[PDB]
A = this chain, B = another copy of it.
């Protein structure tokens, strides 16, 4: 189940958010401004079997003083499973900072990723993963402010 943006039971209030798109080999990362309005692309983290990506993702949360971390949740058919496993591993690592699952279905991110795949050079493939992170994070921020109003 995706989490609900701006849920009062979970919302930590104002501050920078981190947003994460979990790819097969690379993880796109975005962050918000301190007032949690606007997503900006940050970096593409290399996914490695030994989990060094979890160390970098937790370092980024610390570096940006993130109050909330958002991970894209793809639809179960399609994997959700990989996103959930990263979200859970990261949640343990960055506690007490909360990690929330953003429903990808509220965006066109899955279509967009599929368009870039067919269009996208290796360096470019890397950096373009941040565009998904921005889109998922922006959705969360937009939905959150809407829910709060």
B35 touches A123 (CB 8 A): yes
For the complex, would chain A's binding face be called helix, strand, loop or mixed by DSSP majority?
helix
**Assuming the A-B contacts A134-B134, A138-B131, are A146 and B115 also in contact, with contact meaning beta carbons closer than 8 angstroms in the complex?**
yes
Q: Which A23-73 residues have a C-beta within 8 angstroms of B?
A: 33, 35, 37-41
B146 touches A119 (CB 8 A): yes
Residues of B with C-beta under 8 A to A39: 131, 134
Q: Can you tell how many copies of this chain the complex includes?
A: 2
A149 touches B119 (CB 8 A): yes
Residues of B with C-beta under 8 A to A35: 121, 123-124, 127
A148 to B39, CA, bound (A): 28
- In the assembled complex, the CB of A6 is this many whole angstroms from the nearest CB of chain B, namely 9
Q: Is A79 an interface residue (CB 8 A)?
A: no
